[PDB]
Design a protein around this ligand. Sequence first.
Ligand SMILES: COc1ccc2cc1Oc1cc3c(cc1OC)CC[N+](C)(C)[C@H]3Cc1ccc(cc1)Oc1c(OC)c(OC)cc3c1[C@@H](C2)[N+](C)(C)CC3
Ligand SMILES: COc1ccc2cc1Oc1cc3c(cc1OC)CC[N+](C)(C)[C@H]3Cc1ccc(cc1)Oc1c(OC)c(OC)cc3c1[C@@H](C2)[N+](C)(C)CC3
Ligand SMILES: COc1ccc2cc1Oc1cc3c(cc1OC)CC[N+](C)(C)[C@H]3Cc1ccc(cc1)Oc1c(OC)c(OC)cc3c1[C@@H](C2)[N+](C)(C)CC3
Ligand SMILES: COc1ccc2cc1Oc1cc3c(cc1OC)CC[N+](C)(C)[C@H]3Cc1ccc(cc1)Oc1c(OC)c(OC)cc3c1[C@@H](C2)[N+](C)(C)CC3
Lengths: 211, 208, 203, 205, 204
Amino acid sequence: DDDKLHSQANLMRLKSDLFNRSYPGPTKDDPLTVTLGFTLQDIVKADSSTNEVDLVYYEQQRWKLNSLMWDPNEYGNITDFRTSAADIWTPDITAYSSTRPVQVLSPQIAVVTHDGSVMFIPAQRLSFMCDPTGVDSEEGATCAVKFGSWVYSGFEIDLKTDTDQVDLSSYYASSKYEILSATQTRQVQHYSCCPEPYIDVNLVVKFRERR
Amino acid sequence: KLHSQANLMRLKSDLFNRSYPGPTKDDPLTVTLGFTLQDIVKADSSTNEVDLVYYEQQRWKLNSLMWDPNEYGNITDFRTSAADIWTPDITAYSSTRPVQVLSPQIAVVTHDGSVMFIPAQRLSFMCDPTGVDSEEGATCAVKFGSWVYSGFEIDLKTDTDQVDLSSYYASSKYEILSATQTRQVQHYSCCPEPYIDVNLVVKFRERR
Amino acid sequence: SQANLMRLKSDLFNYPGPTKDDPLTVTLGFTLQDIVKADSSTNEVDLVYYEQQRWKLNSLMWDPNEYGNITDFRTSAADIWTPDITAYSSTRPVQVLSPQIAVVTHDGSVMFIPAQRLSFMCDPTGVDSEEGATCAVKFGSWVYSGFEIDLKTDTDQVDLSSYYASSKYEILSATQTRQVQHYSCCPEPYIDVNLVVKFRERR
Amino acid sequence: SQANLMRLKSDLFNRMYPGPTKDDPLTVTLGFTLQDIVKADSSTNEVDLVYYEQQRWKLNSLMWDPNEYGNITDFRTSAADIWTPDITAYSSTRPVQVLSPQIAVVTHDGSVMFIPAQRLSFMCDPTGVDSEEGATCAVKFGSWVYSGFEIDLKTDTDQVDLSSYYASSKYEILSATQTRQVQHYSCCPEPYIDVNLVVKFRERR
Amino acid sequence: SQANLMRLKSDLFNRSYPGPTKDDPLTVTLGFTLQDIVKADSSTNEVDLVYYEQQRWKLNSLMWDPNEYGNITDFRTSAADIWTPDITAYSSTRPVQVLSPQIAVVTHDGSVMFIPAQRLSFMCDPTGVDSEEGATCAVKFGSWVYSGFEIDLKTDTDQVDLSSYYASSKYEILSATQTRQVQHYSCCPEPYIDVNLVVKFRER
Ligand SMILES: COc1ccc2cc1Oc1cc3c(cc1OC)CC[N+](C)(C)[C@H]3Cc1ccc(cc1)Oc1c(OC)c(OC)cc3c1[C@@H](C2)[N+](C)(C)CC3
Ligand SMILES: COc1ccc2cc1Oc1cc3c(cc1OC)CC[N+](C)(C)[C@H]3Cc1ccc(cc1)Oc1c(OC)c(OC)cc3c1[C@@H](C2)[N+](C)(C)CC3
Ligand SMILES: COc1ccc2cc1Oc1cc3c(cc1OC)CC[N+](C)(C)[C@H]3Cc1ccc(cc1)Oc1c(OC)c(OC)cc3c1[C@@H](C2)[N+](C)(C)CC3
Ligand SMILES: COc1ccc2cc1Oc1cc3c(cc1OC)CC[N+](C)(C)[C@H]3Cc1ccc(cc1)Oc1c(OC)c(OC)cc3c1[C@@H](C2)[N+](C)(C)CC3
């Protein structure tokens, strides 16, 4: 009950050291790479009257800041902590073809590790632009939606995925829709309009009515 | 009475302007979870969503919240807003829509440092209701647990294997065949932490 | 006189809820305005009503004589404690239709009357018959036991003087009744006001 | 310019009107501009309107003299910055949805103009809408918590402004009026004042 | 450098805009990028449009010398933290739904660029959308509270950007125009400015 009082005291001081003394977001001089991963849980609805499809997925977001690092030794072997997302800067990762505000299904809480890495995994329901024509056929339908920063250019936020394969191991086994394939791919595009690169992660999902 | 009010504000002030940042590997917390199913409102076989109304009883206990009632005018408990205290981030793992909260976000803290919080909710979750119009009915399942704490920081426990059905609405469109809540612990090659959840399985069918 | 009002509000504000030794009695009453919807596919009924709430606090007494003949004021419900009155068989969050503003009287009584839309559990079978349908929903505190909060009605007649004359549904009767319940599981009384409405398709 | 304005506001907002009282009652003028009858639902007896509600009142505690403030005669301010009346429809079926910025104009004479655009669902039986006669519905507007002892209401005209009514609405407008009324109930000594919005309308042809 | 930015932000905000006035009017630039007509409801005559508005204005109190601040030329700030123009649709039938983060980019010249993505329901008779010639609807945008003496609204370009319009929408766009309109009304000596967006569209 004195180890425990002492360990709490260490956590509160770490959080005050990082949060109260000592983040404006990335700049071209100090750019940030966010690692993104999708875990598709369900294609919930495919609306052929409006060409909207609703997905439920988790989005794992990961980045690393020097100003969040600390030494576990000065803070009682604390190697990580949970904190509300409002306590830290988080990337404005946004779907570029959503048709309604994304609905958050999970607690807005992040895990900060001693080397400055942050991991934040919002579960979400998204309506996005998609013609589901062909979903009732063997070859199925294909849709795509890009994710990336809304306001930071490619000189300030970069992105990558650890694999092209969307994680399907939690995909709902009785969904109305069967997944034929689902890929997530970093894409850098150059436009003449603009000297900065446009970076996004493209999520391509091919699916059909479960038979 | 004007005195008991004085003692309540003082207790609160002592507990809340003196010194709890959430559980850690060094200071883990056991959350006891129990479900009371009130209604299955809707089963949608076009999207495989089912809507439940249920109560989620959450209980945990902290040293930082204990007091001696003798020192505070015999006060043995008090109510406080859930924003005022740490609460566990218990979450359904296969919801299809944000849960809608039906009850006041206020908890009851007891002098032994136990907290009870009972959010009533309507939840849409993933569920194929095929067979609901048959004798055998349909079965669905949804896992609840911490979103961000592993089994190293929050352990979950049930007080019973049975979901409380005694308040189930007797004129629901659906009748309950069985409703159980089973703690489960799981490990993955990738990761060293245990993951703990409570699996809510409900078998149900169209009322006769 | 505006002078006088700010000074009273000044004096009074500068109440953390009831306790077992300082309990609170809340008076409830309902003004049924409309049965807007009765969905027989889900057994949900939607009602629009005013939830009349009143309680009295020692804290809020004053002399209309020490303050320019000011017998009452209005204040945002957000500046004051209000009881956590909740339906016990809603299916959706309640939607509030009116400003959240309370009226405090010099006798220390607070009146707060939100108009609200509520979906609750109700089988409307029989609504297209002469006998019509009958549904019930109970209201009461969610987090205060009957040791800290008690309830009462001023009358058992639901106020129907504002019932919408052209609703799809006519009201055959509507009663509001304080209930006290005891259960073996639990050592506090369960107190609530039960609203029972009998109604049928208008003809 | 901005120094004068930032001073004005600091002065007015730092030297708060606690609402009207019986001793100092307030008159609020209301008028409606009806834009559209968006939907009429005959299964639930709910009609939806989109309108602008012009509210206007006048406080002594919001007067200033322009020459002490660089010839400023008016300013725009967030409506959460000032008291605004709790004007409410008495028979809505869904929370009212606000379609415009919650910003008011204060003028040097202490008068305030606030004009929220709103969408409103309200209790209305649309029977007869598919006929030449049309349907008729009414909704009353007034203060939720102030009786006629603290808030009096008025209109400048009892004709609803239809000059902006949408030309290709599903529903044509036959007439629309806004009438101040004073009610006295046996229960209560206070007068209750409202503006009654009555609309007749039919399916456009 | 992370510190140069953390100081620039201090100087501008927590060390000093009550919006525009008749003596200090603001020019605001508006342009539309249309992304999807999602739905046209002929039972209620509403159409739902997903689109972006590019807003741009320049303020003196947002000027700074780059070489006094680490060669920082621009930054990103939350739109809640700066004044932003009250640009509103004059005939929407439901509150706007915001699809993107509400973050503006401020440049050293004091210019501000803000690009909200939104879904907007507005009044629109879709009669004709199932025929070769389509249906035509219009929606005007402008300040709700500031006349043309306080906010002077202009288009950035004369053209609606259709380059990112979703190719597999239920509805094809046959044309879309954006045009600044000035009107004098008899209540008031001030000019009133809006930008009218006119869209002709039909079922794909
Ligand atoms: C200068 O502006 C742009 C440059 C380039 C494009 C759009 C542009 O339009 C805008 C983009 C963006 C914003 C505002 C825009 O206008 C005011 C704000 C937010 N960011 C900066 C993040 C992007 C977000 C963003 C939004 C739309 C977008 C790409 C990025 O559109 C595209 C697609 O996705 C829908 C797509 O997918 C298959 C394929 C293509 C495009 C666009 C790409 N076109 C057609 C040109 C080529 C092919
Ligand atoms: C220990 O728990 C309970 C004990 C007793 C009951 C419910 C219980 O379940 C809960 C009740 C309550 C809470 C949480 C509960 O679970 C953890 C939190 C909020 N309070 C404390 C305020 C009540 C709110 C409340 C909620 C449900 C409720 C009664 C009160 O259900 C009933 C009815 O209304 C739905 C009803 O109507 C005819 C008739 C009856 C009941 C219940 C009463 N049964 C069936 C048992 C007997 C008859
Ligand atoms: C917060 O305060 C109120 C909020 C809302 C209203 C009155 C209010 O004020 C009082 C209510 C009450 C009292 C005193 C009040 O203020 C000193 C004394 C006792 N109770 C607590 C029981 C109610 C009883 C009560 C008294 C008056 C009353 C409604 C209920 O007024 C109305 C009507 O009936 C007269 C009526 O009839 C068709 C229609 C309407 C109203 C009122 C309702 N408006 C205009 C707003 C809407 C339409
Ligand atoms: C003084 O009162 C008004 C005078 C003039 C009009 C509306 C009026 O109603 C109001 C307008 C406005 C407000 C409040 C109003 O009421 C108190 C708040 C602030 N702004 C400045 C934003 C306008 C916003 C505004 C709102 C509606 C509006 C025009 C402007 O309606 C019109 C249109 O479509 C929206 C349209 O295009 C098809 C064409 C026309 C109109 C109107 C213009 N008529 C028919 C008369 C002429 C041509």
